[PDB]
Structures are given as structure tokens and as C-alpha cells.
Write a protein that binds this ligand. Structure first.
Ligand SMILES: O=C(/C=C/c1ccc(O)c(O)c1)O[C@H](Cc1ccc(O)c(O)c1)C(=O)O
Lengths: 122, 122
């Protein structure tokens, strides 16, 4: 669910996840996908495509548990949606961390998301 | 389309429409609906429910014709759906104008949109 996703992003990036990514670029947070502005945005693009692969899951509401082993996220749920959502969320939190150095606050509150150029199909 | 809506909002409110309303509250701009935060937001809630009622046209994409003369909006009726779409947009622009007095900049970039409480079904 959103709560787990936010926590993973917070735990991997150290940033306030909704504030920093909730409206970032053409793909992060609210709304859909669009041409990525940068690497951080591409992380979010990939994340939304990851969600789209799933059938019958609710990425916003479906709560799952995850744990830490050796400072790495462990997705141990047996429920297929919960496992897959967890893996999508883990991947985007890692990707956002990996690309932290090019985070650009200019993109943080993108009130022009609806005018983003159309994303390529997932 | 978003172009006519933005034009009406700028005509009626004098505000940069995407900057002022593109991420405002739980209902304005990008994203879906949610419990309205204030009167401006409630304008946006009603607007998105208006869009949901339409049949036969696409509120994001489809252009339509209206006139702005003597600071009054008149919607064209060459197409019945575009007429209704135009009326949705006209109503939100007026509603936003009339609630500018309680516009709250703290709600302008609502990066917590996905955590809005469930909106009233339309
Ligand atoms: O706790 C909530 C929301 C709870 C909630 C309430 C209704 C919903 O429909 C829903 O999906 C969630 O709001 C925020 C939570 C929050 C999450 C991630 C952040 O990065 C943050 O700054 C705040 C707050 O503390 O003000």
C-alpha cells in the first residue's frame, strides 16, 4: 500500500517521500506517466509500469509487510499481489536512492503533469 | 479540453490556472477526487463529478467553442456533449472565482492527494 511505499522511499532515500516525490516530474506520485524529466522521474515511470503488470492488485490500498536483512528490503509475503507490489515498491525506493544525486527540486511540484508528453507504452 | 478550461479559469479568476489549481487540495487538477478541504476544493469536486456524467466526449482532450463577451461565457451547442463539457468548465471557473477569498496557498501543491479521505460518490 501507499504506507509501505512511502516508508521504503523514506528508508532508502532519507527524504520525506510524499513531499519529495508525490508530484515530481512527469511520473512520480499523483497522476499517470509521461516522458521522464530525469533519472528520478524514470524510476517512477518504471514503477508505474511495474504496477500495470499486475492484474487485480490495488497498489494504493493492499497492505503488506516487509522486513530488513543486511540493510536490504525483504519481500516475504506469500500472497501474489502483496509480493509483487512489495517488489515494485522496493525497486522504486532503491532506484530513487541510486539517483538521489540528480534529484532536482525544480521538478518537485510539477503542476504541469497533464501537459507532459505522452509516455512510451510500458 | 484543458486549454479551454485553463482559459476560462484565467478569464474568471485572474489566476495562473495550472499553478494555482493544478495540484490544489484533494480535487483540483491532477489526480482524482477526495474529501474537499475547502470551498475552492469543493468547486473542483463538483467539476470532476460533472465530467464523470458526460457521454460522448473526452473532457481532457476534446476542444470546444465558447465565447467570452461582456465577461460572460456562452457555450456552443454544435455537439450536445461538448455543450455539457463547456458548462462543466464554465461552472468551475465561476465557482473558483467566487471562492478566491478563501483560497489557501498551503493547499496549492497538495502532495498528499492520495491520502485524501474517500470522496462522496458522484
Ligand atoms: O496520514 C495521512 C493519511 C492517512 C490517509 C487518510 C485517508 C486515505 O484515503 C488515505 O489513503 C490515507 O496523511 C499524511 C501521511 C504522510 C505520508 C507520507 C508523507 O511523506 C507525509 O509527509 C505524510 C499525514 O501525516 O498528514
Amino acid at each position: 500500500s501507499l504506507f509501505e511505499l512511502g516508508k521504503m522511499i523514506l528508508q532508502e532515500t532519507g527524504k520525506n517521500p510524499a513531499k519529495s516525490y508525490g508530484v515530481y516530474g512527469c511520473n512520480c506520485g499523483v497522476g499517470g506517466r509521461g516522458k521522464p524529466k530525469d533519472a528520478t522521474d524514470r524510476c517512477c515511470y518504471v514503477h508505474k509500469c511495474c504496477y500495470k503488470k499486475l492484474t487485480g492488485c490495488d497498489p494504493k490500498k493492499d497492505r503488506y509487510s516487509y522486513s530488513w536483512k543486511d540493510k536490504t528490503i525483504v519481500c516475504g509475503e506469500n500472497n501474489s499481489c502483496l509480493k509483487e507490489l512489495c517488489e515494485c515498491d522496493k525497486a522504486v525506493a532503491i532506484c530513487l536512492r541510486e539517483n538521489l544525486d540528480t534529484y532536482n527540486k525544480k521538478y518537485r511540484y510539477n503542476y504541469l503533469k497533464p501537459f507532459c508528453k505522452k509516455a512510451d507504452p510500458c
